[PDB]
Amino acid sequence: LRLPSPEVYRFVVKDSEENIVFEDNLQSRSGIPIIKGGTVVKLIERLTYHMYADPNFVRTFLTTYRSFCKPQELLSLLIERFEIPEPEPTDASADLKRFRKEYVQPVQLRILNVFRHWVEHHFYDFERDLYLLERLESFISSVRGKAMKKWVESIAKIIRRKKQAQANITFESPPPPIEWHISKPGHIETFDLMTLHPIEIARQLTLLESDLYRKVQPSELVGSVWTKEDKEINSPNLLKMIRHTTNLTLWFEKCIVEAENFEERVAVLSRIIEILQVFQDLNNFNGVLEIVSAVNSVSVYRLDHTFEALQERKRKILDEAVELSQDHFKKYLVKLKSINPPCVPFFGIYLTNILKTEEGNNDFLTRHGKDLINFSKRRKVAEITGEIQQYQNQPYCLRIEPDMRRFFENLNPMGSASEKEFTDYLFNKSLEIEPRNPKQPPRFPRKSTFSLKSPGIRPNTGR
């Protein structure tokens, strides 16, 4: 009772459809009102509401806010919220005592709770922006409220821990012995699709893809930020994962189309299908669907002579993989739900589903007279991004082979060419090795001398 004037404290402007919109349904009957949208001011007010705690909103807000508000602006808004002016006196004590107990203290504790969640669950904002951390530490160090003391200490201890974990691998059971074929350790120059063991290609790619996947934060996906001007800052782990997928997909395509000799090309496709089967055995659906993407590419898809020459069992394994992707990944989604982790989900489908949600819902409930942020849109994207988290907790029981890891981290099939110049190259080479005519395929010689014979995908050294 008795708040500062809206003139001196922007939060306490009267709630209206000008500034805040709530769900009006059977769910929003009782409990905390559900926010559909608002001005950033009203979202901040509701994030730090005097009348009740809202942990669900705090969690969703700190996952999604970068799609409507910069980290620097969030910190400025929370400090603005904290600095509450005293109401205009009636004439000439008691009122101030209530205001401090019922309004100021609860709002200030709610802000310090937001700070605690922010540093606990989204410290990457501060790792990315040292000035943001300087502002935060300066502010929290200025807070002198007697009730604030345990909160400031809590925040300070989280920051100490977070900093210490940017300075400072452990098997729960024996991992399998590393498989070798023609290529030998420390002979990274001899490393090739066909000289490495297909088992160990699949294992080392799985460890690499698992590591990339486990580093992607939900906030790298919200607001389609990976396709926008601040993508390198908002989505650095997701961009690494996408660049990995592009490079590995184009590498598979390159290995096939550059195999000018028919027998070598069939052996290369056969070996990629063996790698696909080990990815399947490892629940690396990311790897499975990268090979599916390579085989459906325009330059490989048209190599009917090469596909028709496969062993029927290899063709069967490939057809079943290709089918996982058909009808909006219906069979993929069934398979993903049925498996025991560890697993590497196909990341492409989360991107597609977020792009569809981002393109299909307005960022704003309206920009006429105010920026009214569509929060319900962000709640929907956070439900999708939330699915990514359930498979980031279980590491693989596989030993890293550091030369193979370096080999796969440094795949550059495009060389110094554009992706478009590279894919035009692959298509023109595809037309050369299997022309658009009804004649038997051209007979080119092999340029490589390695045996085409697969060691197969039953562990040998495993023994």
Ligand X SMILES: C[C@H](NCCc1ccc(O)cc1)[C@H](O)c1ccc(O)cc1
295 binds ligand X (CB under 6 A): yes
DSSP letter for each residue of 286-334: HHHHHHHHHHTSHHHHT-HHHHHTS-HHHHHHHHHHHHHHHHHHHHHHH
| The one among 52, 131, 171, 301 contacting ligand X by CB under 6 A | 301
Q: Which is nearer to ligand X, 254 or 314 (CB)?
A: 314
Cα–Cα nearest to 382, from 42, 72, 138, 63: 63
Taking the complex as a whole, how short is the minimal distance between the CB of residue 330 and ligand X, in angstroms? 17
Contact 218, 297 (CB under 8 A): no
427 binds ligand X (CB under 6 A): no
311 binds ligand X (CB under 6 A): no
Cα separation, 76 vs 235, whole angstroms: 23
291 binds ligand X (CB under 6 A): no
DSSP classification of residue 284: B
Number of shown-chain residues binding ligand X (CB under 6 A): 8
318 binds ligand X (CB under 6 A): yes
Which residue sits closest to ligand X, CB atoms considered? Answer: 307
Axis-axis angle for helices 55-64, 105-121 (nearest 10): 50
**Ramachandran class of 328: left when φ > 0, alpha when ψ lies in -120 to 50, beta otherwise:** left
322 binds ligand X (CB under 6 A): yes
Q: Which is nearer to ligand X, 56 or 296 (CB)?
A: 296
The span of 45-53, 126-134, 302-310, 352-360 binding ligand X (CB under 6 A) equals 302-310
Q: Which is nearer to ligand X, 208 or 273 (CB)?
A: 273
Residues numbered 80-99 forming contacts with ligand X, rule: CB under 6 A = none
326 binds ligand X (CB under 6 A): no
Per-residue HEC secondary structure of 324-380 comes to HHHHHHHHHHHHHHHCCCCCECCCHHHHHHHHHHHHHCCCEEECCCCCEEEHHHHHH
Cα separation, 23 vs 375, whole angstroms: 11
The span of 117-125, 252-260, 265-273, 298-306 binding ligand X (CB under 6 A) equals 298-306
| The one among 73, 319, 419, 432 contacting ligand X by CB under 6 A | 319
Cα separation, 73 vs 66, whole angstroms: 10
| The one among 307, 364, 427, 444 contacting ligand X by CB under 6 A | 307
Residues at the site binding ligand X, with contacts judged by CB under 6 A: 295, 301-302, 304, 307, 318-319, 322
